[PDB]
Design a protein around this ligand. Sequence first.
Ligand SMILES: CN(C)c1c(Oc2cc(Cl)cc(C#N)c2)cc(CC(=O)N2CCc3ccccc3C2)[nH]c1=O
Lengths: 549, 403
Amino acid sequence: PISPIETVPVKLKPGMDGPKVKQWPLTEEKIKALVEICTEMEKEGKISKIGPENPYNTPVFAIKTKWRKLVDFRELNKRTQDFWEVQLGIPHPAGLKKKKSVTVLDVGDAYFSVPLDEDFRKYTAFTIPSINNETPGIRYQYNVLPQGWKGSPAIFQSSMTKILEPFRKQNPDIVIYQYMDDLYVGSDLEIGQHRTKIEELRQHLLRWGLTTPDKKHQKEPPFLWMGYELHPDKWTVQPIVLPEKDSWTVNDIQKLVGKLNWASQIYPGIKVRQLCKLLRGTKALTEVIPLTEEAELELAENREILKEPVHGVYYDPSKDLIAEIQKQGQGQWTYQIYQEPFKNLKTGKYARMRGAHTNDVKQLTEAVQKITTESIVIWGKTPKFKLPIQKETWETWWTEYWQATWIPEWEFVNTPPLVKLWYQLEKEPIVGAETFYVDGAANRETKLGKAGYVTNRGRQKVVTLTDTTNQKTELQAIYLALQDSGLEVNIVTDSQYALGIIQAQPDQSESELVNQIIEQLIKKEKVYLAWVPAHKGIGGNEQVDKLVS
Amino acid sequence: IETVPVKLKPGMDGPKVKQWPLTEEKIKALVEICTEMEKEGKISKIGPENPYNTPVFAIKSTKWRKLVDFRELNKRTQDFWEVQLGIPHPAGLKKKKSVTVLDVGDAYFSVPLDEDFRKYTAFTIPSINNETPGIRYQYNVLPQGWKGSPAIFQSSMTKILEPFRKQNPDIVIYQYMDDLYVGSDLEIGQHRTKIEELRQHLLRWGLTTWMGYELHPDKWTVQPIVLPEKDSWTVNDIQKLVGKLNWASQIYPGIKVRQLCKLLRGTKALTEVIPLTEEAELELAENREILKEPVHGVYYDPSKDLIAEIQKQGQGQWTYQIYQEPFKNLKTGKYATNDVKQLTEAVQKITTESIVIWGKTPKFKLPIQKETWETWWTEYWQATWIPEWEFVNTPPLVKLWYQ
Ligand SMILES: CN(C)c1c(Oc2cc(Cl)cc(C#N)c2)cc(CC(=O)N2CCc3ccccc3C2)[nH]c1=O
């Protein structure tokens, strides 16, 4: 059919006119097939013949043992207006409420069963060329949504929505989800009453020109949909085979990481970090990359996790969400969401370096934030969190930190590793403690660093770095003061850069130098860090500036 | 009442802003609201032929309320609401003894909106877990939150206020978006009485309308840069005091440092107490005086954008600075249960003040993660507008320089 639904009005892009694309001379087989296909369509009202007056043209092509018409809507797609996006996101199985019965109904010839805006149809004109373009080709234009046209997905979805709107209003008891050609109808009605409700839907659809599959042709659960399996009272990702290979190409590892990322949705403790590190630099797609030992260790552990299958449960809106997070290796985090203890709705992981230097407390918050956003998307509410950090540790951190950090209801859960601050810079200068005035200076052109220091106990020192920036020298300067020093120490610098880094209590960093400084900072008992303006004539800073310059 | 033609300029399109995920209670609140507004004719459902979008949120009392983020549309409609139909800002408002802020956004629902402009006002109520395509609407009347709404409505506004203004010519009313700012030198009982009378004016014409009852602009002052008055001075204390003053000299004309540097002579212990010289005490008190006064040389430029920087001082304490050219402060200040809740109150306080003082809101440099703020800001937000914001790392030195 073609839905009675009123057409959606379509414009071109304001300062543009529809396509005048030359039709290529086609082969006889193709010229023959098109005509045959066009006649069959024409008689169903999908297309209509048109006069030579209409100046618009789009290429048509034929390709195979059925023949298929392929219309090249590229020029029209450039010239047709932008539309609203189809969906803001795709649903997650974890977010689905549990229903007694659910059925899948796919619309037959979805786009072709929906009318195009009368005023726009002229722009959809195409020409079946005569054999060796001797004579005027046969000229058609679409009355319905063309295949491969920019607006077909949106207008279809939009049309379908208006068509369901009444049925939804009449039947709030029933739940429907639209996804492309498909409809998924669910209810808590006893199986007999469902079939009827489906029947009057199928009818209601046909009343509006939308054909659906007979009860005998409807698919049965599990529903293989978008890489998931949706069973009567559980869901899971579709089966994951980790290729058993002697040599791993870049391509193989990419397909593995992708597969592991997908699996991490319901399989806990999935890790990808060491597999990702292999992909760094840029190699050939086919290039064989030798697996490091830690890569080999992750792969094995992942193979253990996948050995037995795991399922996720569906969402019950009258229970609370609970999110648990565990640390597992620096940077790497894993979470589980459930409502009833350990019947997981879903799983996941977080393992990105937001910035250059960070600590476990900062990363736990970023993880929590990421999980909070995800829950709001999926369930429209935030979970109760169960976190591997002491309230007192958190209390200490957020208050002293300059950024505004906040997180919703959470409780501590003793699931080692426990998140902790691995050092605590002092609030006051340390009496009976050496005061190191550090400084650095890299000659811009030669890049010859001269990191060094001066102390109030008399000591001086200047090493020579090579090919370093001023940032490195000022930081190497600080590493020296920590190296050549007691368990207590006071360090004066004129580098806000270094101060900023270290005042954040980082326990993790990309820079080699910074991790060296962290090592020292953990080993110390008391460290106090102060800043001064450079070149302003300060007792100590000016002295270090001398031997550094 | 027929519609005023509205324009975008020739070379920029409408807003295509993503809708931020909302909690279920807000989504439910939003559909009830939007059902009423469709029945009442204020908005109409739209198809996918409208490619524009503007975010919407729910806020509060226990009354839910619809907030639409028109920051992009306002940005793209700048010529219309600022040059063509601009509302001038009265410099007197800041001088007044008390200033009450009244919500007048209901006024805009009576005036219809330019038929050819309505497409640019499209918004989406999203679905939980993306179950549905989400409910798409657009405005038929003037929308609250758009800067064109008062720009168009001001002619009707003047009529409403004309009698009150005639009868009260030492009270100053100012429209900024959905709010009227009403300032008098009257005593508070009379001020409040005069507000209640203004409500009745607006109640005819159909408008039933970080901050106390009222603001008090005349009592606003610069939070001076705190130079400590210490009994005893260590080397650290001087170093702290020098950095303070060093950076203050880049803002204030004639801040001197010389004397205190000489005290930091060679390479001393930070712990070490040090005797205070005479000229050091002189310069110190002379700097103190300078910091009490406003910055000489800095003036508001209407062409340039205002910018607000905020620092967390711990213990529910927040400092802030408004300026246009970096570190040339037109105003600085302070604000006294959780981090985001406070930050959002602070932003609202600072914005209100910015409007009263300059008739513009500042682009905020917020000390927070983009996603944390975006998840939570609506939870405690009570304003009808939304200022521009970006997300920043606080340089911990500047946090210290403002107490
Ligand atoms: C109607 N609707 C949106 C809906 C479901 O339908 C869907 C939803 C989505 Cl995103 C994809 C598919 C496919 N392809 C089916 C499934 C469930 C999960 C569920 O309750 N199930 C899973 C399938 C099923 C099948 C038969 C009997 C019971 C159940 C119970 N819950 C629902 O509310």
